[PDB]
Design a protein around this ligand. Structure first.
Ligand SMILES: [Mg+2]
Ligand SMILES: [Mg+2]
Ligand SMILES: [Mg+2]
Ligand SMILES: [Mg+2]
Ligand SMILES: [Mg+2]
Ligand SMILES: [Mg+2]
Ligand SMILES: [Mg+2]
Ligand SMILES: [Mg+2]
Ligand SMILES: [Mg+2]
Ligand SMILES: [Mg+2]
Ligand SMILES: [Mg+2]
Ligand SMILES: [Mg+2]
Ligand SMILES: [Mg+2]
Ligand SMILES: [Mg+2]
Ligand SMILES: [Mg+2]
Ligand SMILES: [Mg+2]
Ligand SMILES: [Mg+2]
Ligand SMILES: [Mg+2]
Ligand SMILES: [Mg+2]
Ligand SMILES: [Mg+2]
Ligand SMILES: [Mg+2]
Ligand SMILES: [Mg+2]
Ligand SMILES: [Mg+2]
Ligand SMILES: [Mg+2]
Ligand SMILES: [Mg+2]
Ligand SMILES: [Mg+2]
Ligand SMILES: [Mg+2]
Ligand SMILES: [Mg+2]
Ligand SMILES: [Mg+2]
Ligand SMILES: [Mg+2]
Ligand SMILES: [Mg+2]
Ligand SMILES: [Mg+2]
Ligand SMILES: [Mg+2]
Ligand SMILES: [Mg+2]
Ligand SMILES: [Mg+2]
Lengths: 143, 199, 63, 117
RNA sequence: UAGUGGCGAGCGAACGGGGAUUAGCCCUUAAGCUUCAUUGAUUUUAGCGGAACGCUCUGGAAAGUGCGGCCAUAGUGGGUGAUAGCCCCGUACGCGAAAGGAUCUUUGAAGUGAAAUCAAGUAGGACGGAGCACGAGAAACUUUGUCUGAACAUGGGGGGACCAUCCUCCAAGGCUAAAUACUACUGACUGACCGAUAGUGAACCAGUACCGUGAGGGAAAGGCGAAAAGAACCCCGGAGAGGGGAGUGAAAUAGAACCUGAAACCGUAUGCGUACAAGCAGUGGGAGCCUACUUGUUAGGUGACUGCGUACCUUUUGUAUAAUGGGUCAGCGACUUAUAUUCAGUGGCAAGCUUAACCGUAUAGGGUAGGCGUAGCGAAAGCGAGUCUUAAUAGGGCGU
């Protein structure tokens, strides 16, 4: 019945309107207060502005550069090696599934749980702990 | 199970039919469908499109009247509306998994409340409205929703002029009409169609 | 996206998963005054204070 | 959906102008004066529910006092005379016996004198 | 986001992915595009036919109350004396052109594209400026105002100062549909749009009246009834204006300045109180009189007398204030929307959740590109349940 159903208690609220009456609580000012900047149309203090003291983001030094070398990096957890088909974890095989982005060339494998099955990594270079898991739990690490 | 009128059970999947009736979900699914059909065509007019009203009607001081700046202001008589609204869309995003759980929740209470009549096959022969009226007199129904696998050209030309009888498809049904009409009439071709569509 | 960050605070504040890093200050261009106990206690990379989190996380558009 | 507010404003004006009838001049017929004289006439009706209880208590006392001097006491020695014993009769139903039932009042006064207080 | 930027306010790419659309031809002379001659298709400027109902009540008048029946590829259209699938016009459907109008296409013709001939005052260079996301900056590249100047495919110029090695293209001559942007004007629809202070400035003879030397500004203005049946005739009046009858009508307190007809404002009757009494004009007690009563330990209206009592809003440490504002009434008149993001409430699936454009028999379904997660530390390379600093594997920071 469309004459019956309604939502859960608390799921909908009713958008309090400032500027109506005196019993509603928000009458005659709307929760703003009295005279000043944050009481007027467009009383927006600029984000980061302090009042005239030298702000934080103009007192501290600039401290680095950005590596364009690591715009091509990704990494795969050991637990996600069971999420591919064919048991040949190539470079394009991880792009066949949605486990990795496009335009990604160099991939590692680190230790983040149990592997799951018997695969053959090639084209990708695992860490010290991941290589001690795959070569021990029935896999093979070739190129 | 779903007792077809030719007296044979069918043993449907018990995840679609016979489920818990969450109605916070169904209320949200019928609001998003019913609001998504509204075309939004308003146009009021702000103080910048009302024709004229460029210059001050008198000086700043010395006149006695209150400080006015233009004629086409929201306080004045011929002025413009102060929060005039351009046309816009009304469309909520409902998830694909969330649209389907409202279907598996309203297709359970139609089974409990016995609004659902499953038939062997429903087929008319010539497009003529008085032939279909006599066909629905066999089942004893009135103001019914006809859900079938494919809307036949003979069946679609009938029940356009007919008053309270509507004909749909499984991929043309919606969470309003399954709640709206008095009785829902499905065929055995269509109850299998809700298996791969819902679960 | 209609939310542009500030370019200065993206160079003064790198973000890790334990807050916001920032380099210390006062260490440039007059250094023969200061004491070695004071120089090496400004060499590290600290993390931001709780009074300053909700100020910077509005300058950086994280709100 | 434009709403015009000319039919629910009128019902609230007639509800004010009904409480404010019987008043002098423009207090009973124009609205921007008759709203002040309904709020003010509601504050007075709140204060004077307390002052009602003070204007009869000051009237009961001044009738016992006149009635008990005619028999040979004061008011203040009568109340100490009744509370040597426990006659336990309040001011509302002594100032009734002072006017109407005058012979029963004299039979009370003699017992306060017999109470020697 | 990388960059850019008094490195301030800010401005902001590309590479790579996903879609819509699908043609490349010539300087040996081409597709293509024009303009006529042509043969068919497609609609377009007017139309035509177009299903099915009776009795009975109340009413001024039946579409309504009743009791039945029929039509349907036509059942929520309009309007007829009140609410009509079946009374009228229409609708679903079917057919329609002397003659023009185009749109695709027929196969011819006249052209044209078209500059002649693979590109010289051209590339590059030097000061001065612009455009590149790029405010002389290690400033590449495209442009042109002044001044100059080459190699001739064993050449050339690109790959963000510069140089060697590799890769990739042929500059100084041209032509090209489609996806695309827009609406002064048309037609068909549709509305959680307006309903005469709204909606166009304009429902009314509106860019009019009026205001200006001019450019220019710019209003107010809807409604009798189903049908004029719009008042023959009589009496007062200036032979008028206006009334009093009489007649029409369901109804003239529907009579043309006409549906309903409120508030401020002004009156006329009836009841009760006031001409020896001082003030935000009310409130608590209260005599008497009046009306209806159910005859008054009821109701209504006046209120002699008497106690307490210096309006409302806004600004302020503070207002009866000789501080602000308001002549009263009736209409309108002030926290909204869109796109991004954070926190709570309530929901879906869950180490996984979800798609944007765009397709679609179009609120379904497809589309997982992309995003946020499942692991951090470091300025970085890098290494990873650890990592950075350090001679230290010593401590310590951050993390599980
Ligand atoms: Mg408050
Ligand atoms: Mg303030
Ligand atoms: Mg104020
Ligand atoms: Mg202040
Ligand atoms: Mg992906
Ligand atoms: Mg303007
Ligand atoms: Mg101007
Ligand atoms: Mg307007
Ligand atoms: Mg979808
Ligand atoms: Mg230094
Ligand atoms: Mg006809
Ligand atoms: Mg007809
Ligand atoms: Mg109709
Ligand atoms: Mg009528
Ligand atoms: Mg009709
Ligand atoms: Mg008839
Ligand atoms: Mg060339
Ligand atoms: Mg040059
Ligand atoms: Mg060049
Ligand atoms: Mg170069
Ligand atoms: Mg290079
Ligand atoms: Mg108007
Ligand atoms: Mg009106
Ligand atoms: Mg008559
Ligand atoms: Mg009347
Ligand atoms: Mg009338
Ligand atoms: Mg009038
Ligand atoms: Mg009418
Ligand atoms: Mg009238
Ligand atoms: Mg008078
Ligand atoms: Mg006086
Ligand atoms: Mg006095
Ligand atoms: Mg204050
Ligand atoms: Mg004053
Ligand atoms: Mg004034």
């Amino acid at each position: 019945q469309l004459n019956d159903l309604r939502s859960a208690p608390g799921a909908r609220r009713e958008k309090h309107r400032p500027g109506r009456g005196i019993g509603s609580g928000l009458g005659k000012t709307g929760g703003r207060g009295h005279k000043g900047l944050t009481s007027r149309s467009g009383g927006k203090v600029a984000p980061g502005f302090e009042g005239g003291q030298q702000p934080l983001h103009r007192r501290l030094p600039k401290f680095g550069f950005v590596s364009l070398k690591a715009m091509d990096r990704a990494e795969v957890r050991t637990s996600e090696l069971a999420k591919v088909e064919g048991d040949v974890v190539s470079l394009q095989t991880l792009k066949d599934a949605n486990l990795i982005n496009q335009h990604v060339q160099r991939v590692k494998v680190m230790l983040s749980g149990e592997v799951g099955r018997a695969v053959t990594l090639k084209g990708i270079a695992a860490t010290k702990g991941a290589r001690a898991a795959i070569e021990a739990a029935g896999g093979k690490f070739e190129d | 199970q779903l007792n077809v009128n030719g007296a044979q059970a069918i043993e449907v999947s018990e995840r679609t039919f016979g489920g818990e009736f969450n109605e916070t979900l169904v209320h949200q699914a019928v609001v998003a469908y019913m609001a998504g059909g509204r075309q939004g065509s308003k146009a009021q007019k702000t103080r910048s499109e009302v024709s004229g009203g460029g210059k001050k009607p008198w000086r700043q001081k010395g006149t006695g009247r209150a400080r006015a700046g233009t004629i086409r202001s929201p306080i004045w008589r011929g002025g413009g509306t102060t929060f005039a609204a351009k046309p816009r869309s009304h469309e909520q995003k409902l998830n694909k998994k969330m649209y389907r759980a409202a279907l598996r929740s309203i297709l359970a209470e139609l089974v409990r409340l016995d609004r659902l009549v499953v038939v062997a096959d429903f087929a008319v022969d010539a497009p003529k409205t008085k032939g279909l009226v006599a066909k629905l007199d066999t089942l004893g129904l009135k103001d019914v929703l006809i859900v079938t696998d494919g809307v036949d050209e003979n069946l679609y030309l009938a029940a356009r002029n007919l008053a309270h009888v509507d004909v749909r498809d499984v991929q043309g049904s919606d969470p309003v009409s399954l709640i709206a009409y008095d009785k829902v009439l499905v065929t055995v071709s269509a109850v299998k169609k809700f298996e791969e569509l819902l679960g | 996206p209609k939310m542009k960050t500030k370019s200065g605070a993206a160079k003064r504040f790198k973000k890790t998963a334990g807050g916001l890093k920032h380099k210390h200050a006062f260490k440039s261009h007059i250094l023969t005054k200061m004491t070695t106990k004071r120089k090496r206690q400004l060499r590290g990379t600290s993390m931001l204070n709780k009074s300053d989190v909700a100020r910077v996380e509005r300058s950086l558009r994280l709100r | 959906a434009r709403v015009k507010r000319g039919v629910i404003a009128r019902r609230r004006h007639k509800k004010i102008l009904k409480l404010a009838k019987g008043y002098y001049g423009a207090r009973s017929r124009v609205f921007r004066v008759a709203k002040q004289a309904v709020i003010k006439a509601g504050q007075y009706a709140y204060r004077d529910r307390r002052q009602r209880k003070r204007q009869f208590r000051a009237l009961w006392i001044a009738r016992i006092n006149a009635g008990a001097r005619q028999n040979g006491l004061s008011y203040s020695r009568l109340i100490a005379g009744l509370k040597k014993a426990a006659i336990e009769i309040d001011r509302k139903v002594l100032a009734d016996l002072a006017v109407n039932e005058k012979a029963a009042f004299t039979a009370i006064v003699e017992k306060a004198k017999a109470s020697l207080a």
